[PDB]
Design a protein around this ligand. Structure first.
Ligand code: 0KX
Ligand code: MG
Ligand code: MG
Length: 342
DNA sequence: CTGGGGTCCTAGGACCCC
DNA sequence: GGGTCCTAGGACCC
């Protein structure tokens, strides 16, 4: 039923806002991540740092081994939040059909738009431009008839570029497209798929659908459909936050309950403030806790609960601390609430 | 040498209904 | 024998 979807993605979003504000970081390797002393990971890295192999979700310990002159910045969320809200208002000028996927990211449906005539290519081009003129940062775009193809397209000519995929180009695009580039196919599934000899969508096009439903369930249908180019998901501008969590990893494993309670005492005020901005009465559906151990196993305990309550969080945290710790060190403790169904 | 914020999926037992 | 809720956990995303 061919639609036209624009996936915009900010390039090096967190880093780019650090460089715009201080140009001294424009041409030196910078990353936002948090110290190796605090056991942190890289969240964003500029291209000078990317040249050394620094990627997002990489432990800072390895980021420094690869690029020792990394200037690590901690990040200013409100600086990135304002930029985003500006980005989303720039989208508001071309369609109401806007589905943000994060701060730096949004699906735009422009099928029924009158703007740069009907050219999804020129709308994406002008949005990418207006962002630069108004925020001095750069965007990439992808244009496709479906959601995931427009997302894959947003990475192909980045940074500061776009890439269009028309319906006639789709069959050739999918034939060589490796399965792991499909959003929702990460490291584990890509490894089993390659264990079955499935690397590209061209390979799964020659597969049996009932076979894939046997082995992967609902995931096998999604797999088989994306390879045929099928992605009926609508751009939904109505999607709502469903949960609020606050967690913290300490410098080193903590071994006594006394220390773990000292962390919850600090975590709770932050969780309440962030819950208050969205729900002033603090009324919720479930609240609970999370511990992650030295062997990186993690357990959570959540239960029905009417209102964000600190003592019950401490209480339940010691029940896990006793029943499921088994004497290992603890590197992370976290708090959580599940919001009420709208 | 492994973050912090989330979404979505699965699955067994409890629970309720015929 | 059905269905929805409850809970824990895992894969995945930015
Ligand atoms: N694992 C990750 C991935 C992204 N992020 C944050 C930091 C990024 O600046 C922001 C943008 O997500 P992203 O698109 O995946 N990466 P980024 O936009 O910075 O670089 P490119 O999109 O140009 O590849 O999300 C994170 O905190 N942890
Ligand atoms: Mg980006
Ligand atoms: Mg993004």
């Amino acid at each position: 039923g061919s639609r036209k979807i624009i996936h915009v993605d900010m390039d090096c979003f967190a880093a780019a806002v650090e460089m715009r504000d201080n140009p001294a970081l424009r041409d030196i390797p910078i990353a936002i991540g948090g110290s190796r002393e605090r056991r942190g990971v890289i969240s964003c890295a500029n291209y000078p740092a990317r040249k050394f192999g620094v990627r997002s979700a990489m432990p800072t310990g390895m980021a420094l081994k690869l690029c020792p002159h990394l200037t690590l910045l901690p990040g200013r969320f409100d600086a990135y939040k304002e930029a985003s809200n500006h980005i989303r208002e720039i989208f508001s000028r071309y369609t109401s059909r806007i589905e943000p996927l994060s701060l730096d990211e949004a699906y735009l449906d422009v099928t029924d738009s009158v703007h740069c005539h009907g050219s999804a290519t020129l709308i994406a081009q002008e949005i990418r431009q207006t962002i630069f003129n108004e925020l001095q940062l750069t965007a990439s775009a992808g244009v496709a008839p479906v959601k995931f193809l427009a997302k894959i397209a947003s990475d192909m000519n980045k940074p500061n570029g776009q890439f269009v995929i028309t319906p006639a180009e789709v069959p050739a695009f999918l034939q060589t497209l490796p399965l792991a580039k499909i959003p929702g196919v990460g490291k584990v599934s890509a490894a089993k798929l390659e264990a079955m000899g499935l690397r590209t969508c061209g390979d799964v096009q020659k597969c049996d659908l009932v076979m894939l439903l046997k082995r992967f369930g609902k995931f096998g249908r999604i797999l088989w459909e994306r390879s045929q180019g099928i992605d009926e998901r609508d751009v939904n501008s109505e999607r709502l936050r469903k949960s609020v969590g606050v967690e913290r990893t300490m410098a080193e494993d903590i071994h006594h309950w006394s220390e773990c309670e000292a962390i919850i005492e600090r975590l709770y005020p932050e969780l309440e403030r962030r819950l208050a901005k969205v729900k002033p009465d603090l009324l919720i559906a479930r609240q609970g806790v999370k511990l992650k151990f030295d062997d990186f196993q993690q357990t959570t305990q959540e239960h029905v609960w009417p209102r964000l309550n600190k003592a019950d969080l401490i209480a339940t945290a010691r029940k896990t601390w006793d029943e499921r710790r088994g004497g290992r060190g603890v590197r992370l403790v976290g708090l959580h609430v599940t919001l009420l169904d709208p």
